[model samples]
Target: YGILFKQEQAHDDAIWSVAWGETVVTGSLDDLVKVWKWRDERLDLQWSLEGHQLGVVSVDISHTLPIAASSSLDAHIRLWDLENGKQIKSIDAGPVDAWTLAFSPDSQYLATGTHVGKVNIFGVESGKKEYSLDTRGKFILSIAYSPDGKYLASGAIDGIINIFDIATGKLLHTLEGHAMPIRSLTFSPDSQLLVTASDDGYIKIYDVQHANLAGTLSGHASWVLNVAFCPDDTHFVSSSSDKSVKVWDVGTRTCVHTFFDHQDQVWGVKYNGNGSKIVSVGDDQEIHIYDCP
Candidate 1:
């Protein structure tokens, strides 16, 4: 077992987003975005960007450039230059409140899901709106682009998952399995499968091609807030409102380990790009990093 190296105080209010690159960036209710780095076996603050008038709700880092995008309660998504901490471009996706944001694998498009149940896709290079998907008035809580950039999966408050055809702007399939609002969604490394966590305290895996429920994982006592797959695609991790984190064997659909050391609800969990470690941040206002066995 690996001990916790740092319990960084990421934000003054709840942290909505935590992503790692060579450094870590966190978006918070304080309307400020902060970056952190590991130093002397501890996480240290590297920089802070302040501009949004409302709480910064969503954040994403681009894999191609030193670029980061953040959306706020102000209903605007701002792209930034990570090198100098400068705002590059600001785009507004109507008046709806954006709950989450993501970038296509190619980094050519940026997508945002709103509380009013719409997903807007924008072409980053052209600064033009490319596609708009309506989720039938159900709040879209989370969204993600497929690893191959050919598809987009959106999870809604009504427990519906919609897969859209990116190029044709068509509704390909509607995945129905969860009974509660989905809080987190992600595509597996190969983009052939999708994993979602819901308020129902379960993680559901689906086949992207067939839009079929492959498996349902249950171990948490309360609402499962976030779910993520390891890079190898052999295991997955989830965090819950019950103040616990679980690591599961994906193939057997079994919980292999349960980690419960947090004092409050665990809201978000993500694996590092290399999948060697997992990081989570939650209601306790702390970011925890753990090494997986």
Candidate 2:
């Protein structure tokens, strides 16, 4: 849909996180979430957003708000107005690392994963903490709300996933199998499948309704850091410390294509809202955009 490029030097240091929506926003160890506007040829920097006291570890854009949020090592989350570089709100995620973040499909609730092994839900407008769901997570690393907005999933360093009923805040499932910490979790657009990436170097797909493991995607030689479902639901992509970004077929449970342009560990990967382009960030300090079918 636009001029696809090979890569861009997104930051001075290794970029730690990235989020995609109507626009692209990258969070780097440089302690800023830089917003880049999409054009016909290249992505140009639109906002040099700041305010985090420490390097941002995670950033997420709302499903419909067109708002961007970044969480830092200081246990704080800053919500920004994407249209103009403005800080609209800020939330304290308690005394924890605040490792990851996700917003509900309705855009009314925000969820965060913390080092304390809990997922904290908050009302985005009031910047108020809502419900705290705690489970086997010894160090919550990743969290995701289902596309249907009915379930909440959180994964930890313990490789356990806790699925919660959004209305009840009650734990519904505890998925286990990975021998190491879980780094990422994502629900398919249909909300029937939940996929996870772990330090064990595998992506495990689970059936949400049955509380069962559906399939496993294995190819990365190192720890798997992130997982993203394609908007079409035909496939998904994952990033790993193996210095590779892999595209996997959802039904076959196999790696279909592997991109090795990132010479260092790949930390994050995301599909744009339209599903035509994939943007990836890595320890190589590069942001690579790829065209997909």
Candidate 3:
């Protein structure tokens, strides 16, 4: 079911991250976040978001709001209105370098993982620092909040994932076993499972309720970069430096499909809002959207 559409020259440089909404938002090494609208056979460029002096590192679309948030090595998070591409406000993340970011289920809270392995949560309405927790590690490249809003997770270079209780900001469990830096993570739609990606070419599924490893999905030939679950949580997708995008059945814990059309590393991949389609960005500066089968 892959290979529905492709947009070439999607950006001038490497596309690092992509978030989907009514529109699509992409962050690039060109130090910009560009918004695009998906058409029948092409993507129409909407606007190029400027202001960040450094390369835009991460971008996320809020689940319950018309806002899109993007951050950079510049250490600032800017929330934009999806309609007019106007800045709602910019919240400065003081003294921390973030590698990736995400919006909470309610769209009111924003969280990001820092280079120093801390998680910072920002309140969207107040445009201020809501809270920051000391994760106490280094190179935390991934962070995610569960769909039920009960838990938050951060993963780092040391191959550790800290699952925390959201309301109390207390570390609940330290998951260990991976031998490579964590590349990405996401909670299942029901929030009962957490799927994690690592450079060691594996995706580990965790049972969140008991803080135990439930299963491991292995097959990627190179570094696995990112992963996302389907809306119903029966299947999940992953992208890798191996230049492939794969869909896996949660029950079988095995790849159900593989797409080998990317010319370079696939850095980002995601299921669309309702899981009807899939979107991905690669080092080739390409954007591909596929109909889910």
lDDT of 3 by residue, 139-236 (tens): 78899899899999998898999998998989989988697899899999999999999999989999999989999888899999899899978999
lDDT of each: 0.82, 0.85, 0.87
Locate the minimum summed-lDDT window of 10 residues in model 2: 1-10
Between candidates 1 and 3, the TM-score winner: 3
Best by lDDT: 3
Candidate 1's residue-wise lDDT over 33-134, tens digit each? 877775444677777988888888888888888888888998788888888888888887666656788888888889999777789888777766787887
How do all models score by TM-score? 0.94, 0.96, 0.96
lDDT against true structure, model 3: 0.87
Residue-level error in angstroms, candidate 1, position 64: 1.6
Rank candidates, TM-score, best first: 3, 2, 1
- lDDT, residue 28, candidate 3: 88
What are the RMSD figures for all models against the true structure?
1.7, 1.8, 1.3
Residue lDDT tens for model 2, 96-172: 74778787888888888877777888888889887788884598888999988899998888888889999888999
Query: lDDT, candidate 1, residue 267?
Result: 77
